[PDB]
Design a protein around this ligand. Sequence first.
Ligand SMILES: *[C@@H]1O[C@H](CO)[C@@H](O[C@@H]2O[C@H](CO)[C@@H](O)[C@H](O[C@H]3O[C@H](CO)[C@@H](O)[C@H](O)[C@@H]3O)[C@H]2NC(C)=O)[C@H](O)[C@H]1NC(C)=O
Ligand SMILES: *[C@@H]1O[C@H](CO)[C@@H](O[C@@H]2O[C@H](CO)[C@@H](O)[C@H](O)[C@H]2NC(C)=O)[C@H](O)[C@H]1NC(C)=O
Ligand SMILES: *[C@@H]1O[C@H](CO)[C@@H](O[C@@H]2O[C@H](CO)[C@@H](O)[C@H](O)[C@H]2NC(C)=O)[C@H](O)[C@H]1NC(C)=O
Ligand SMILES: *[C@@H]1O[C@H](CO)[C@@H](O[C@@H]2O[C@H](CO)[C@@H](O)[C@H](O)[C@H]2NC(C)=O)[C@H](O)[C@H]1NC(C)=O
Ligand code: NAG
Ligand code: CL
Ligand code: CL
Lengths: 24, 425, 425
Amino acid sequence: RSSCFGGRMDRIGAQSGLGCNSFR
Amino acid sequence: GNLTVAVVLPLANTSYPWSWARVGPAVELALAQVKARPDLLPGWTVRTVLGSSENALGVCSDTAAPLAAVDLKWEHNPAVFLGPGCVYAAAPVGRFTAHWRVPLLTAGAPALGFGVKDEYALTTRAGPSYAKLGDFVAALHRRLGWERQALMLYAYRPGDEEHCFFLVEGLFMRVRDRLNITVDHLEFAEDDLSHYTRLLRTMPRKGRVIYICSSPDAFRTLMLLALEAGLCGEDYVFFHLDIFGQSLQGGQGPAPRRPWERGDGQDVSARQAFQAAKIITYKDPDNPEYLEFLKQLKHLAYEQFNFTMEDGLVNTIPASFHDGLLLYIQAVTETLAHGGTVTDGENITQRMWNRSFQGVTGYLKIDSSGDRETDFSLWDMDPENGAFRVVLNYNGTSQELVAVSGRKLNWPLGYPPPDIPKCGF
Amino acid sequence: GNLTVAVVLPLANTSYPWSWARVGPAVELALAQVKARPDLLPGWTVRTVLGSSENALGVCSDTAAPLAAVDLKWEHNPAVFLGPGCVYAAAPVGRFTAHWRVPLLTAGAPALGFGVKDEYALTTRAGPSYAKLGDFVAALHRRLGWERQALMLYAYRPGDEEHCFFLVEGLFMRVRDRLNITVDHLEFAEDDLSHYTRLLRTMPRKGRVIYICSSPDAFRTLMLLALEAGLCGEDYVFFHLDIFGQSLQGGQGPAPRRPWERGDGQDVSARQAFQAAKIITYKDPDNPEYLEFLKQLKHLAYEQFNFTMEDGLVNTIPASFHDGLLLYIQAVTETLAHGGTVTDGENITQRMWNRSFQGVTGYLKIDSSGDRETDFSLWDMDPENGAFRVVLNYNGTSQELVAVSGRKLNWPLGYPPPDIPKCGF
Ligand SMILES: *[C@@H]1O[C@H](CO)[C@@H](O[C@@H]2O[C@H](CO)[C@@H](O)[C@H](O[C@H]3O[C@H](CO)[C@@H](O)[C@H](O)[C@@H]3O)[C@H]2NC(C)=O)[C@H](O)[C@H]1NC(C)=O
Ligand SMILES: *[C@@H]1O[C@H](CO)[C@@H](O[C@@H]2O[C@H](CO)[C@@H](O)[C@H](O)[C@H]2NC(C)=O)[C@H](O)[C@H]1NC(C)=O
Ligand SMILES: *[C@@H]1O[C@H](CO)[C@@H](O[C@@H]2O[C@H](CO)[C@@H](O)[C@H](O)[C@H]2NC(C)=O)[C@H](O)[C@H]1NC(C)=O
Ligand SMILES: *[C@@H]1O[C@H](CO)[C@@H](O[C@@H]2O[C@H](CO)[C@@H](O)[C@H](O)[C@H]2NC(C)=O)[C@H](O)[C@H]1NC(C)=O
Ligand SMILES: *[C@@H]1O[C@H](CO)[C@@H](O)[C@H](O)[C@H]1NC(C)=O
Ligand SMILES: [Cl-]
Ligand SMILES: [Cl-]
């Protein structure tokens, strides 16, 4: 895994793009 | 004896590649082929019990699929689950059936997290996976002399179930454990025109080999803006991860596609912006046994579900469900012939993994970790008429690229641009 | 009649704040009080049915929690769920009970996604939530005059269920909503030194006000390197988001703390390294009934579960379960008074939300969104003996940041440093 990929496939951790590169 | 198959798929919504409208007919063809073959479950009966995986809103949900699966188990005691297709629906059901020690067949659930076979210990994936698109990109890099750096962009659209996030996740996490390249990602928002400008201002200093997962219109807009900005393709190459070939009107069959034409008026400047763009897509099986399967599939989809199938690569999920169910039945015959039980679960799956099988889609290969070896194809433009076509197929079991009918990739300079300019950004 | 209460908590692992070893006697004191109050639920009894939310490995799980909840729901018909604490275990049960329309009380599950209330409908959080930390931080920023930048760092450790990720996510989202401030985020591994070195090398370029979520002994090796690199306290402030006061032996008392003291040979440099560091914890209730409740709770925890409760600040989660269950009982009592029923989930719930209460943790107030209003505390160093003690209590009900009498924030320059350096980044 990295700071963005390789987590759990639950919708609870997808609320914020924290740790990922994003424009939003 | 009775072998019960539990289906947790979208029953009413017919917009998903794994909807019961499309998968339903295919499971009917398969289950009649085991009944017509004496050498497959001799004298046993196969019955299907249906459970939905969608809300009252008609969208596949992570809270309706687990509860439907629990009800199905309590009321029928299935031998196997035909499995959800959605990532968030399939995750909890995958874990649940792992705990119950019952297999789970599914041509969906392509996310990267299902490859952790210490949690989804029994999940067999008979369809395409997003992790196996990263070893296609690795071979593509090796063939074209790319060993330093790349860039990957995925787009956010509220409606979809984070499709491009997962696709780029698999691609990124697989193409940097078997390559020594530096890959960096970035996310923008679809149809936020202020994001494309920032994306163009960023891209020149981040990479020269770019992989974009977006909708066809977003890709066309990005290509036009890149052409305006001067990213002319003598030093850039953009790859469009269009798995189902929705920019190519389904991507199935030999026919000029020209995916840059929409009558918008600016389809003349959208033609030279696509001469530095390749498209990555699932491979269409060319078997004579596959085209005969689609015909009766479409017929019986119209007869029994009032749904009219449109050609395209999105039809390889019904066929993958067909092949997976046939593989499961053939592996359950051998478990009985050896003095086993139809409810082993653990012994049945190991007779499915690291095994190669002949189905309508071709000669399958279920790798030793459960997933099925996927084939992709590369499309590029023809300078003569400017129409895209398949130019390079990738066989996922032998892991080697194959050219098509003497077709050479159309590079504006003749050879691929480097992934780092002469004066490194 | 009888009012069943379904419990989904770790019934065998005594290392979680919300572990039935700790919470177990907390709800027994609550249920022993309604029996002593004729004016609470007069003509009914209350029962507890326990389901575990633990793997066979002995940790919270997102496959055992929902399955235990389903078994409890179908075997017994509950009136409420005392709910899991672990976020990844509480999410599935939250959705399940929202579908069944059964209220879910929980002093854990602090993640930000539990507050949507279009998904987790009928979920009253009677304990701390990470979003409410953003309110405290915003009040801090408005008070100390810095309203233009901040940097937040969360450390990654394989063991903990991404505690710091969720904490910093809640703080980040809430601050971004409360302040027109630009913030950065970053993740560093917890157990390697290259990450610390690169972090210190790239910290001076991204902010001067830093919030760190990490282990108590990894914020001290960061403070030593920062001192060695010249990042004195004139320019920087380092906030340690230690919500449960691990770095302060719990922080449940008025004694001096000395979090920089280890006696390992470099205990002198650490004292001037911590002169630039503040610590943010939860607020320990100051009412006598909380102390009496702790005195009873630890005796009962030892005398019924063979567990020696530690004297710390992690005991406000048991007290939160106690107060939340008493509040639920009051609400259902009111509902029964007005010709209601135990099974009116929505009507029982709507009387809990948006109203104050008097428990053992003080005078409560549950926001109109269903989440209790959290009180925080801020520690600082004494210039004389270098001992840490509280200087600013924050009241979440009125959002008032009130300083302790006789204490004040001590800055090296006499006033808070800027968040943007005068010269520039
Ligand atoms: C945090 O802030 C609140 C103020 O918002 C503090 O005081 C409480 O304020 C409410 C008004 O919002 C008072 O009602 C409450 O005291 C009365 O509450 C009920 C109201 O009917 C009454 O019956 C009681 O007898 C009492 O007179 C205030 N709290 C107390 C204990 O009286 C609150 O204390 C602050 N918390 C901390 C830890 O400082
Ligand atoms: C069938 O499913 C599709 C999902 O592909 C639904 O379309 C989505 O509907 C939601 C509303 O719940 C929107 O937020 C999304 O933006 C929609 N996405 C797309 C791609 O359209 C569709 O509404 C469903 N229809 C039926 C009849 O069930
Ligand atoms: C991809 O390559 C594999 C092998 O490299 C091909 O698999 C062979 O298929 C034939 C067809 O019956 C078998 O008899 C062989 O034994 C297979 N080879 C093996 C198992 O090593 C496969 O056909 C190729 N894919 C395509 C589309 O041609
Ligand atoms: C109790 O739970 C704790 C979790 O807080 C367990 O400790 C973790 O165990 C996992 C694997 O079991 C490790 O990956 C973590 O590093 C551990 N974290 C620690 C030790 O802080 C513990 O094993 C459980 N014990 C029992 C008896 O249930
Ligand atoms: C919540 O309570 C307050 C008073 O405590 C009241 O004024 C308000 O109307 C209630 N409902 C809300 C804020 O939605
Ligand atoms: Cl599904
Ligand atoms: Cl739990």
